[PDB]
Write a protein that binds this ligand. Sequence first.
Ligand code: KJ9
Lengths: 224, 210, 196, 220, 256
Amino acid sequence: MKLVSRLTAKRLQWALVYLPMLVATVYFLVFSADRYVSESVITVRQTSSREDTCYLQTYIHSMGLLQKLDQQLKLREHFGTPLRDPLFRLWGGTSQEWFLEYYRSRVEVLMDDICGLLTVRVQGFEPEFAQALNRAILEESERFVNELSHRMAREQGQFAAAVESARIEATRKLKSLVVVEPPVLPEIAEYPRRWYNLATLLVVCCLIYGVVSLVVATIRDHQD
Amino acid sequence: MKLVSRLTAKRLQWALVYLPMLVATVYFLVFSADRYVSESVITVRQTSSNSREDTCYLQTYIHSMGLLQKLDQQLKLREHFGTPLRDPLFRLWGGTSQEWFLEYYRSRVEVLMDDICGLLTVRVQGFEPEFAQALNRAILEESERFVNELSHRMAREQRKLKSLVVVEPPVLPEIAEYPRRWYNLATLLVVCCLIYGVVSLVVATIRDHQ
Amino acid sequence: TAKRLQWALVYLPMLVATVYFLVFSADRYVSESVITVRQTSSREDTCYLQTYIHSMGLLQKLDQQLKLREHFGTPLRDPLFRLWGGTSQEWFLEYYRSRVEVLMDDICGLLTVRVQGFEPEFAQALNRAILEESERFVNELSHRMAREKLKSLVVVEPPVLPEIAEYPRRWYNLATLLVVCCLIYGVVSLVVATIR
Amino acid sequence: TAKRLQWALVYLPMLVATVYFLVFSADRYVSESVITVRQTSSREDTCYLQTYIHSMGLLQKLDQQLKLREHFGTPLRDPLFRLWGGTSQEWFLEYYRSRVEVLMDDICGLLTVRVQGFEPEFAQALNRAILEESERFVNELSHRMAREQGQFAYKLALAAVESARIEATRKLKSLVVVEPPVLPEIAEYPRRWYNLATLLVVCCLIYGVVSLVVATIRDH
Amino acid sequence: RSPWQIQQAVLFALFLRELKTRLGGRWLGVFWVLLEPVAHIAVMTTLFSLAHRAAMPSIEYPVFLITGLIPFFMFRGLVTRLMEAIDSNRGLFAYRQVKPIDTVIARAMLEISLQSIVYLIALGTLGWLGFHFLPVRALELAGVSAVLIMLGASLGLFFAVVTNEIPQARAIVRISLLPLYFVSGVIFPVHTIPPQYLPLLQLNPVLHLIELSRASFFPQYRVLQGINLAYPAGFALLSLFLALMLYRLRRHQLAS
Ligand SMILES: CCCCCCCCCCCC(=O)O[C@@H](COC(=O)CCCCCCCCCC)COP(=O)(O)OC[C@H](O)CO[C@@]1(C(=O)O)C[C@H](O)[C@@H](O)[C@H]([C@@H](O)CO)O1
C-alpha cells in the first residue's frame, strides 16, 4: 500500500540495474581469478562396449578416486591458493561432502552417444597442475579397469591344470585404455568469461526491471 | 424445368420407393437360383527346406487362367454354369468370351487370406452341392500338383518337396448360402427409403427456389 | 454470353470422342503373364527384371526378333494409338513402354506383365519372347559375373491367348469424359456467374 | 505508372526467353545407363561409385582421354549453355557435375547415369568411358587394399605369401551393367515449356510484390 | 506533446485495460496460465518418459519439455491473441489518440511479460527440484528468443490485418495452431523421426527456433543439418515487412 508508493522509477533502476553491474564489474575485472582447463578424450577397448565407459564415467566422479588424488597431488591446498576469489576458492576446514561437490564441479565429463567417446575437461588455477591432474585421472582410470579385470580373474583363481590359466588371466591386462588426445597444456584461461557474463547479466536485469516496473505500476494503479 | 412440378410425392414414390421392391420380390423369390457353397481351409508348409510367400503364390495361381482351362477340361464348368435358365444374372450365357468366363469364375471362387498367421480359405459356389465339393477338391488337387511342380522344375533343372496341409477339407453343403433373399430385401428397403428422403428434400428445395 | 461456354466447352469434346471411339478406334488385344525369378539352389533379380523389361537393348533384340515397328504401323484408321512411320527412337521407346505394362506386387515379390497388340497371337508371341529373353538375361548376368543355369524363372501364369478386345473401354472412357466435362462446365459457370 | 511496369517486368523477359529458346538453343542428347556393382566371390561399393562420378580426378582422366574441353565450347550459338573458352577449373567441375546426372534407387539398388552431350556419339562414348573408369577404379581400390598385406610379408608362411600375392591381381569386384549406354537421336533437353511456365510463375510473383510495394509507397 | 509521449500514454492505458480483461474479475487467468504447463508436463512425462529416456540418456525429460514448451506457449499466445485485438476495441476508436496498432502492441507486450514471468517461475521450480536449470550460453538463447518473439508478433499483426473481415477464418488459424504443436519438436526429440520426413518438416521456422534454443540451453546438444538461424530470421523479416505494408495500406478501413 503505502510501501508500494514509497519508491520511484529512479529508485527501482538503482535497485535492480546499476547496483548488480557495480558488484559484477568489481568482481569479474578485479576480484575474479583465472581458471585454465585441460581437455582429453578417452575410450576403452577389448584387447586382441559402452558398459566399461559407464563404469569409467561413474568412477571419475567417485569418492575413492578423490581420496587417491588428494593423497597424490594434494588438491585441497591447491584450490585454496586463490584468496583473491573467495567464491571459486575452496575454503579450508570444509566438510568432505562439500569437497566432493567442489571436485565434481571442477572436472567435467561428457559423453556423445553416436561415437561413444568420453571427454574430460579439468579446471585448475595453474596450467601444469591441470595437465598433471588430467594425466593422474587417466592413469588411475586405466589402473582401475585393469584392477577390476584382475580382481575377477583372481577370484576365479581363488576358486581353484586350470591354475596356470587362472594365473595367466590374472596377469593379462584384458581391458586397456587408449588415449585419442593426450591431456593438453593450456596457455590462457578460458572459462571465467567476464564480458560475456556481463552482457547476459545486462539482458537479464533489463528484462526483470521491465517486468517489475510494469507490475509495480499496475499494482499502484489498482491500489488507488 | 417444367417437369419438376410434375414429380409429386405420390409419383417419385412409385418411381424409386415401391417399384424397386416389386422387381426385387419378383426376382429374389420366383426368379433367383440357389447357390450352394463349399468351404475349405489350407496352408502350404516349408517341407521343401531339405512361408507366407508360397501362400500368395497359391492365391495368385487359383485365380489364374491356366488352372481355369484345366478345370474346364476336367469338370466342364462352362456347360454346368449355364444350367439355371430361371436366373440370368447368376447364370453363364452361352457363347460368351473367354475373358468374361474368367471374370465369372473369379467371381464364383472366393479366396481369402488370414493374415495374422496366414490361412488360405477357399469358398466355391455351385448350383449343386456335390458339384461345389467336386470343384473344391479338384482345385485342391491341382493346387498340390502345382506347388509340387513348383520345386520339381528346379530340382530337375539343377520326391515330394513341398506339401499341402488340409486344415478343413472341402465340405458338402446341405442348404444354399446365397442368395440372401430377406436380408437383401431389408437392405434394399433401407437404401430405397434413404434415397427417397434425400431426393424429396432436394426436389422440395429446387421447387421452392424456382 | 453463356451459350458459348454451354456448347463449345462440353459438346465438341463429346462429338470428337464419339467419332473417335465408335468408328476411328482400333481394337487392342492384351495378354498377361505372372512370373517370379528364383534361384535354383531374390528381390534384387526381380528389380533387375523390372528395369530390364522397359530397357533399350531388350527393345532392339525384340525388334530384330519380331519387328514390332511393322506390327504397330498396320492400323491406319487410328491416328493416335498407331505408331507413325519414321519416328524417333525415343518416341519408339516411350511407345513400347506404354504398350507393355509391368506391375510389382512387393508383399510377395510377384511380377505381372500385360502386353497389348493388335493381333492376339502376336501379343502371346511378344509375351513369350519377353519371358524367354528375360530368363536368358537373368542367367547371363551370373554367367558374366562368374566367367572371370545359375538361376531360373518361375512361371505362375504363362502368357494367355486373348479372345476379345479388352482395350479400349469406349463406354467407360466416354462416361468419365462426360463427368469431367460437366464438372468443368459447373466450375467455370459458377465462377463466371459469381464474378458478375 | 500502371502499365509501364507490366511492359518490361514480364512481357520483355518472356519475349527474350522465347526467342532464345526457339532459335538460340542447341540440341543436347542424353545417354542413359543403369549399373550395379557385384562381388564375384554391397551398398557401400555403389555409394563409393556415386561419390566417384562427381569427383575431380575422374574428370581429369576424362579430360585427358576424350578431351571434353573443346567439345563443350563448340556450340557458339548458346552463350550460357556452352563452356566458355579459358574458364576456371572449379567452373569446369561444376559444369561437368551439372551435365552428368546420377540417381540411385535404394529399394531396387541400381545406379542410373544420364550424360549430356552435343553429339549423339559423344554421349555414348563418354558414358562408356565413365563405365570403364569406374570398373578400373573399384578394381584398383581393391588392389591397393590388398597391396599392404601383400607387401608386408617358415615354408607355410611363404606358401601363404604365395597364396595371398594373387589378391593384387584377382578381379574380386566386378561392375555388372544392366542397361548399357545408348545412342540417342532426338535431344531431350532443353525443356522449353516447363522453364517458360516457371518464368510465368516467378514474373507474376515479382510483379505482384512490386505492385504492392509501389501502391504502399504511393500515398506516402 | 511529442508523438512518442502520447504513444507511451496510450500504450500504458491500453495495457492496463487489457491486463484487467485478460485475467478474470478476481484473477482467475493467472491460475490457468500457471497450471497449463503443469498439466502438459504431467501428461507428456506420464506418456513418454521411458521413450524419451531411451531417446538420449543425457537430458532429463522435464527440462527438455519446459525448454521446448514455454517458448511455444509464448509463440502460440502471441499468434492467437494479437488477432482478436481489432474486434475487442471497435467502439474505442473514437478518441483520436487511439490506433489499432496501439492495441496490437499492448496485447503483444502483455503476452511477452506474462510468458516471461511463467518462464522465470518454471526455471526456478525446475532448479528447486534438482534438475538442470542454468543455460550454458544465455546470450544466444536471448537472441533466438527475440527472433521467435518478433516472428510471432509479426504473424499476429498480419493475421489481425488480413482477417479484419471474415471472422470465421480467425477460428481456422487456432485449429492450425494444433498440429504446429505436434510437429515443431516440442514433445519428442526430432532425432527419432525417420529421415525422409525431415525436409518436409524443415520449412517450419518454429522447429528451427526451438532446436537452436534447446542447443544454446543444454551443454553438448546435437542439431541436425539445415537448422540454420538464417531461414527463421528471413521468414520473420519478410513476415514483418508484409504485415507492416498491409497495415499501412489497409489503415483507414479499421474504423468504428
Ligand atoms: C489434414 C491435416 C491435419 C489433420 C486435420 C484434420 C482437421 C480436423 C477436422 C475438422 C475440425 C473443424 O472444426 O473444422 C475445421 C477444418 O480443419 C482445418 O481448419 C484444416 C487445417 C489446415 C492447416 C494445416 C496446416 C498445418 C501446419 C503445418 C505448418 C474448420 O473448417 P470448417 O469446415 O469447420 O469451417 C466451416 C465453417 O462453418 C465456415 O467456414 C467456411 C464456410 O463454409 O463458410 C469458410 C471458409 O471457407 C473456411 O473457414 C471453411 C473451409 O471452407 C476452409 O477449409 O468454410
